[PDB]
Amino acid sequence: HHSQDPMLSKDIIKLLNEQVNKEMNSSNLYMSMSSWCYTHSLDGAGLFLFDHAAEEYEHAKKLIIFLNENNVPVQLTSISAPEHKFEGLTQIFQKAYEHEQHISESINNIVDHAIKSKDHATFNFLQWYVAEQHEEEVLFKDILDKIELIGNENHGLYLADQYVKGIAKSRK
Amino acid sequence: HHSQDPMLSKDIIKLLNEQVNKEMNSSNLYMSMSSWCYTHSLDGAGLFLFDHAAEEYEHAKKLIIFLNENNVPVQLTSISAPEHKFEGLTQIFQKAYEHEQHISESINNIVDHAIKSKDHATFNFLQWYVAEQHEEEVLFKDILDKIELIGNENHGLYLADQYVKGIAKSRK
Amino acid sequence: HHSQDPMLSKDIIKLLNEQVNKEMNSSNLYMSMSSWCYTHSLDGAGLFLFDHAAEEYEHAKKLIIFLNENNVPVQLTSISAPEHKFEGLTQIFQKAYEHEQHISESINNIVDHAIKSKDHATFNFLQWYVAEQHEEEVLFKDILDKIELIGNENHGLYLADQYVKGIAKSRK
Amino acid sequence: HHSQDPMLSKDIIKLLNEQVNKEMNSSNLYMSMSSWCYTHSLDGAGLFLFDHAAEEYEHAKKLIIFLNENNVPVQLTSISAPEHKFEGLTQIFQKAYEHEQHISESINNIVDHAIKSKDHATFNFLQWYVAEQHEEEVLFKDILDKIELIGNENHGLYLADQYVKGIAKSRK
Amino acid sequence: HHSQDPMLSKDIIKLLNEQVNKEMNSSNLYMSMSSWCYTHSLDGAGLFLFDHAAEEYEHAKKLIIFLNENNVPVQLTSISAPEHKFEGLTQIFQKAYEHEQHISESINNIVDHAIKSKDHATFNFLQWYVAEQHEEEVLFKDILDKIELIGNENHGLYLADQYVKGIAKSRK
Amino acid sequence: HHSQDPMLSKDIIKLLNEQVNKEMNSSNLYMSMSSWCYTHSLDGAGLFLFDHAAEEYEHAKKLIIFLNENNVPVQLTSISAPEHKFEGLTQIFQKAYEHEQHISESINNIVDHAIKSKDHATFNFLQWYVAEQHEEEVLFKDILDKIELIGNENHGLYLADQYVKGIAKSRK
Ligand SMILES: [Fe+3]
Ligand SMILES: [Fe+3]
Ligand SMILES: [Fe+3]
Ligand SMILES: [Fe+3]
Ligand SMILES: [Fe+3]
Ligand SMILES: [Fe+3]
Ligand SMILES: [Fe+3]
Ligand SMILES: [Fe+3]
Ligand SMILES: [Fe+3]
Ligand SMILES: [Fe+3]
Ligand SMILES: [Fe+3]
Ligand SMILES: [Fe+3]
Ligand SMILES: [Fe+3]
Ligand SMILES: [Fe+3]
Ligand SMILES: [Fe+3]
């Protein structure tokens, strides 16, 4: 039997499939960061990063659904093992914020290509993703700001972890 | 500051981490099978396999939570690129059933090791997973039996896909 | 058409099929004991033993369901005619308690074999059955204890039968 | 102590006891037919025949209750091992319908004997059983008619099994 | 009058009776630790440890109930006078965590012996206890981790005690 | 840091700590009596005495709470092993009633000393305990009276145990 061709252009297909893989890679990075926190008495950050990891995978799934509905083959590549070597809470959140900036840039690039290609189905679809990623990037900026404001001296780590725990609980 | 040592034995830690990675690999395999179905006019099987993929990832997350609570570092490996080329619906479900048999065996091995090691915290924890995996294995056996009973001749693929669609919707 | 092979090992299949037949045999034994009581003015014990007979058959049915779901042929043998010759209420409950001990032993043997064979699907499945059989064995111990405490002298049988009637009614 | 004599005549006692044993035999036959269906990818028929088997045992229990209330000893015989080898769905339902015809005849015989003996307590008691058996006999006639109308060619078995599955679910 | 023999084996009887006494030793230890905290301005830890002591006694009672139902004599030994002198909050929780590890090991040993003896009534019964003990052991690990993360330096004791107070209140 | 001195006098501290240990001893005695009843077919008395044992420990805990709130160190001594051998139901309740009389005397002594010392905080606190102990003493007098009224002959033990069972259940 004959099935209809992919409804999206080759360039958009490539960008979206790359994004699915990016989100899967991201989810594993956050699981690794989460585990570091949990094994270093930082269960507030552990919980926050675990729930964030789960959310990034939810994004991957929503992108997959869009590919499926457009008859676009989902092309899953090898998901690289995440980094696991971390120096401390501040470094983890510094890395995480930089990572979120990279994710934001990647989404901006897809949306820009959708505009250039006149693919307004894809442009319109990605709007929830633009909005949610913006919220996540801001969130990581705010947490990093707070960790750096508190510091790590006299009970600093405890204060920071409890702050992050509060955020984790308020979001679930 | 000093954090407490992992609460599980070395062998159990390794088997559980390997299981997390098995479930992640499984989830990506099912996403790939799902995509094949969606791109070959089999949206019933597509939906079923997508939802199943998401469920295997849920299992991975529950395993991660247990590792976290026991102060056990989670070691995520590189998740292999799943098979993407398939012959048809029957082959996909034949492969899936064999895969579920492998997953069941892997869990049996962990539970057996927990008994031998006298790790009854882990034995007790794994019981939901034993039960859910058994249900999933039986489910794939049943779907494969039904696909083989219907066959591929005449409107066979349509009938089989609609049957699988019904299961997918009922499990939501 | 091809149907999938039994999902359980040959040894486990044999043990479970034997257990189905054991429960059917047990249900008929209890019906016989019940009838003896009803025809000797002991309607309290009659009701109790009838309802117990029905419960043992419910166990047989649940075991059958498990065999069915695993694609295991149910092999029903001849169900031997139950003993019908009884001396009195005490003897009936002495025999019944010994019988329940035998049933408990038989279940212990299946669970032990499941562990040895690493069949944790079956181990996990049998847990409701282990728990319920334990309750039933304890119940028969308690009733036998009470019958022996009361005795059969001045209104003893009436007192014992009314005691058992109370239990029967409280359980339904 | 003295217990009152059986309240029913010798002939009626024998026919009723024989009927209890007939229903027990019937229940085991249907369990065997059900198992054949479940192991040959016919889970619709499997479910239907399992539930029917359980219902025949319910009839046996109601007959036993009546014997008990009339101070009539229940005489349980050895329940024969049921047929376990079958040719297919059509043969199973052909055999089942013939079996239901036999059961209907057996009940007709008891009711007739009750009239001849002027045992109107028994005649009156049996009316629910006459009514329920008639419904069951008609049901098996209808299912057999449908299996024969569909046939075994093409997707015939699948269609027939799904039809029977629908009936099974609607009767729950 | 004759009462039925104990329903458990001599070895299991010994292990379970030892466990009852272990829980009653534990309960008294925690009451003593709790008192130390209350008399040294640590009412958060005082409350937590008092409530924990009460819970260990609840476990002892549940074990006693199981012994009673199996006609097993409860053999209460002398309960040793608990340690009453302590160095501080960190030492108390270090000692408590080590103690909970010992309790976990003791339960693992009973469960292992139940498996070896084929006593699946006892195995099944102990599962709530395995699960609850695991939660308690994890809890003490978590509290010790937090006490160590905070430290005893300027306001440290206050912060740690308030943290423990929050846990105590949330578990009520 | 400085913690405030105990708020009670040395004599009152001694009497209250002695009372905590008395109640713990009492609870273990009643657990032993309960077990005797349970292993000699007297589950009515078994349940009653088990629940009473638990209640005596509840008293111990309430006393401990009062010591804690007054910054008074709790001084737990060795709890000696309870008597495990008994002659029968009457003997157990005779011993129990005498024991309750002793407990009542001990409380009277503390209250008297509180009045003499002008410790009206303690006098006021103990009023629930005076009232509850009075009810318990009266209860054991009533049960002993009933056991003696019934006797040990001709179903006497059964009648007495059932009477006590009724009280146990009504107090739950
Ligand atoms: Fe993000
Ligand atoms: Fe994102
Ligand atoms: Fe501070
Ligand atoms: Fe699975
Ligand atoms: Fe799985
Ligand atoms: Fe039983
Ligand atoms: Fe049973
Ligand atoms: Fe009497
Ligand atoms: Fe019928
Ligand atoms: Fe019938
Ligand atoms: Fe058709
Ligand atoms: Fe504990
Ligand atoms: Fe414990
Ligand atoms: Fe008292
Ligand atoms: Fe008292």
From Swiss-Prot, chains A, B, C, D, E, F:
Protein name: Bacterial non-heme ferritin
Species for this entry: Helicobacter pylori (strain J99 / ATCC 700824) (Campylobacter pylori J99)
Protein localization: Cytoplasm
Domain Ferritin-like diiron: residue ranges: 7-151
Name of the gene encoding the protein in the UniProt record: ftnA
Catalytic activity reported: 4 Fe(2+) + O2 + 6 H2O = 4 iron(III) oxide-hydroxide + 12 H(+)
Family, similarity comment: Belongs to the ferritin family. Prokaryotic subfamily.
Keywords of the record: Cytoplasm, Iron, Iron storage, Metal-binding, Oxidoreductase
Binding site for Fe cation 2: 56, 100, 133
EC number(s) from the headed UniProt entry: 1.16.3.2
GO-annotated molecular function: ferric iron binding; ferrous iron binding; ferroxidase activity; identical protein binding
Segments traversing the membrane: none
Primary location class: cytoplasm
Record note on quaternary structure: Homooligomer of 24 subunits that assemble into a spherical protein shell (12 +/- 1 nM diameter) that can sequester at least 2000 iron atoms.
Statement: the UniProt record of this protein carries the keyword Membrane: no
GO cellular component: cytosol
Binding annotation for Fe cation 1: 23, 56, 59
Lineage summary: Bacteria, Pseudomonadati, Campylobacterota, Epsilonproteobacteria, Campylobacterales
Biological role stated in the UniProt entry: Iron-storage protein.
GO biological process terms on file: intracellular iron ion homeostasis; iron ion transport
